Design a protein around this motif. Structure first.
Motif, PDB file in Angstrom:
ATOM      1  N   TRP A 113       0.838  -1.220   0.000  1.00  0.00           N
ATOM      2  CA  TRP A 113       0.000   0.000   0.000  1.00  0.00           C
ATOM      3  C   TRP A 113       0.867   1.263   0.000  1.00  0.00           C
ATOM      4  O   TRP A 113       0.295   2.357  -0.128  1.00  0.00           O
ATOM      5  CB  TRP A 113      -0.934  -0.074   1.210  1.00  0.00           C
ATOM      6  N   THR A 114       2.183   1.111   0.135  1.00  0.00           N
ATOM      7  CA  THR A 114       3.179   2.204   0.302  1.00  0.00           C
ATOM      8  C   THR A 114       2.811   3.446  -0.529  1.00  0.00           C
ATOM      9  O   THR A 114       2.653   4.526   0.068  1.00  0.00           O
ATOM     10  CB  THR A 114       4.566   1.700  -0.111  1.00  0.00           C
ATOM     11  N   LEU A 115       2.694   3.321  -1.854  1.00  0.00           N
ATOM     12  CA  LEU A 115       2.434   4.483  -2.749  1.00  0.00           C
ATOM     13  C   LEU A 115       1.068   5.078  -2.424  1.00  0.00           C
ATOM     14  O   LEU A 115       0.945   6.308  -2.475  1.00  0.00           O
ATOM     15  CB  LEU A 115       2.494   4.051  -4.215  1.00  0.00           C
ATOM     16  N   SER A 118       1.661   5.876   2.036  1.00  0.00           N
ATOM     17  CA  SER A 118       2.928   6.064   2.800  1.00  0.00           C
ATOM     18  C   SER A 118       3.776   7.229   2.284  1.00  0.00           C
ATOM     19  O   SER A 118       4.904   7.341   2.777  1.00  0.00           O
ATOM     20  CB  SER A 118       3.761   4.801   2.814  1.00  0.00           C
TER      21      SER A 118
ATOM     22  N   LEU B  38       7.832  -1.217  -3.427  1.00  0.00           N
ATOM     23  CA  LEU B  38       8.358  -0.721  -2.137  1.00  0.00           C
ATOM     24  C   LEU B  38       7.383  -1.106  -1.033  1.00  0.00           C
ATOM     25  O   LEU B  38       6.155  -1.005  -1.226  1.00  0.00           O
ATOM     26  CB  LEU B  38       8.544   0.793  -2.165  1.00  0.00           C
ATOM     27  N   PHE B  39       7.946  -1.535   0.091  1.00  0.00           N
ATOM     28  CA  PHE B  39       7.248  -1.678   1.388  1.00  0.00           C
ATOM     29  C   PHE B  39       8.237  -1.246   2.467  1.00  0.00           C
ATOM     30  O   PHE B  39       9.443  -1.058   2.184  1.00  0.00           O
ATOM     31  CB  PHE B  39       6.736  -3.105   1.556  1.00  0.00           C
ATOM     32  N   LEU B  40       7.720  -1.058   3.674  1.00  0.00           N
ATOM     33  CA  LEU B  40       8.486  -0.477   4.804  1.00  0.00           C
ATOM     34  C   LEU B  40       8.692  -1.537   5.880  1.00  0.00           C
ATOM     35  O   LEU B  40       7.940  -2.538   5.920  1.00  0.00           O
ATOM     36  CB  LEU B  40       7.727   0.726   5.374  1.00  0.00           C
ATOM     37  N   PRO B 112      -2.131  -5.087   3.193  1.00  0.00           N
ATOM     38  CA  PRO B 112      -0.792  -4.606   3.491  1.00  0.00           C
ATOM     39  C   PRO B 112       0.088  -5.803   3.866  1.00  0.00           C
ATOM     40  O   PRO B 112      -0.391  -6.736   4.477  1.00  0.00           O
ATOM     41  CB  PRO B 112      -0.968  -3.645   4.678  1.00  0.00           C
ATOM     42  N   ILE B 173       9.162   9.751  -3.857  1.00  0.00           N
ATOM     43  CA  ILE B 173       7.877   9.282  -3.235  1.00  0.00           C
ATOM     44  C   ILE B 173       7.865   9.482  -1.713  1.00  0.00           C
ATOM     45  O   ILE B 173       6.786   9.812  -1.171  1.00  0.00           O
ATOM     46  CB  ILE B 173       7.618   7.816  -3.613  1.00  0.00           C
ATOM     47  N   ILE B 174       9.000   9.253  -1.058  1.00  0.00           N
ATOM     48  CA  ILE B 174       9.186   9.410   0.409  1.00  0.00           C
ATOM     49  C   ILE B 174      10.505  10.124   0.637  1.00  0.00           C
ATOM     50  O   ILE B 174      11.546   9.487   0.392  1.00  0.00           O
ATOM     51  CB  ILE B 174       9.206   8.038   1.106  1.00  0.00           C
TER      52      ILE B 174
END
Ligand code: OXL
Ligand code: OXL
Ligand code: CL
Ligand code: CL
Ligand code: CL
Ligand code: CL
Ligand code: CL
Ligand code: K
Ligand code: MG
Ligand code: MG
Lengths: 216, 216
Positions: A113-115, A118, B38-40, B112, B173-174
């Motif tokens: 779900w990042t984009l 996040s 991407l994920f965190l 997620p 993006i971040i």
């Protein structure tokens, strides 16, 4: 030191719960689960009052989500549901700013779900509310206006999973540090927000906040 | 206060890239995308050498993923691909510890990856490797042994997306802070690890590390 009144400067982590309001879950036709959905925001998703919300380039269809924030006062590993509130420093009113079109595809393809959830400034945040100022956080009204016009209201009594349950349930999966924040989900009435919209949200009798929307 | 040699103590953010090695992408039969997944992880996913990796209660099928970490030296907003390396402080060897069974369902139901990918001690991490010590990070061999026995090896030349591209593509993006870390994906040969397994991994001629597996 690391002052709670500016937690967003030094806070490391942000955890968000999905599907904590029945009305909102219907609104999406996503089904409620035995346990709450969790996803994260980075520390750089904080947009303190005075900073605008920033639509990402890729964002076709940005949405507001007014949520209640729970800031933590102590390192918290597998915190018991019955101890949760010992570990809470205070609260903040938050927006779970969301790229819905992105999130739709992220769900289709079964991706992070990042984009969607996040990105930089995806977590606009009120001034810090100490805990003494809220005797009971399940007896609060959340509201959000776009250009003076109300779009979202809900009571924290409507929460499927309690706050103490969440603090416990999260701290079992991810240790929580001093200054880490938990967003507790959004009620009915999430909807689009376009460039140079003016957002107001609040908790009746506790705090209000204003955020302007900009681009790249 | 902020010694790079112990970045995991004060580092706020961790970003992980998915599908950055063709061999690994085949190994899963998940398809490559135009842009990296991407994920965190939260800051509390760091397990520095001396700490064990911890299977979560809910975890039926834990997996090792050896990945190259890129630590950042200054605040990074929309870093140009051609500047990326100016912003890099150094590296660390990392494990993208994964609840595969969880991740399978997370993907089915379009959820997620948090429980699959973001749990406490889900990011075991080497000693800090300064940048002087790596002239070229696309000319490295990664290896991981379980109980003396090799299971994962790959070359950083095999990376679909370059590191400079990633630093740039992520920072669009971040926003990235001093001390934020990027995992750059895992090669062929990911597989299970069970209680009281003994993991060794390294970068030939640069660093090695040891991690024990425990439970709840
Ligand atoms: O899905 C969400 O983000 C929620 O329910 O708040
Ligand atoms: O899928 C992943 O996690 C990867 O490719 O590293
Ligand atoms: Cl969108
Ligand atoms: Cl995610
Ligand atoms: Cl207004
Ligand atoms: Cl699992
Ligand atoms: Cl190589
Ligand atoms: K974080
Ligand atoms: Mg939400
Ligand atoms: Mg990985």
């Amino acid at each position: 030191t690391k002052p709670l009144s500016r937690f967003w400067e030094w806070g490391k982590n942000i955890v968000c719960v999905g599907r904590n309001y029945a009305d909102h879950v219907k609104e999406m036709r996503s089904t409620v689960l035995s346990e709450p959905v969790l996803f994260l925001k980075p520390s750089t998703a904080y947009a303190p009052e005075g900073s605008p919300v920033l639509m990402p380039a890729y964002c076709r269809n940005l949405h507001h989500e007014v949520e209640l924030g729970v800031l933590l006062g102590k390192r918290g590993e597998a915190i018991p549901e019955a101890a949760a509130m010992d570990y809470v420093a205070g609260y903040a009113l938050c927006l779970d700013m969301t790229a819905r079109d992105v999130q739709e595809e992220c769900k289709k393809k079964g991706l992070p779900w990042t984009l969607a959830k996040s990105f930089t400034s995806s977590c606009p945040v009120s001034a810090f509310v100490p805990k003494e100022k809220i005797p009971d956080p399940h007896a609060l009204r959340l509201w959000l206006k776009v250009n003076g016009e109300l779009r979202q209201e809900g009571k924290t009594s409507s929460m499927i999973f309690s706050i103490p349950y969440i603090i416990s349930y999260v701290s079992k999966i991810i240790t929580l540090e001093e200054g880490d924040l938990i967003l507790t989900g959004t009620p009915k009435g999430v909807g689009p927000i376009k460039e140079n919209d003016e957002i107001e949200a609040g908790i009746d009798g506790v705090v209000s906040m204003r955020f302007k929307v900009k681009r790249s």
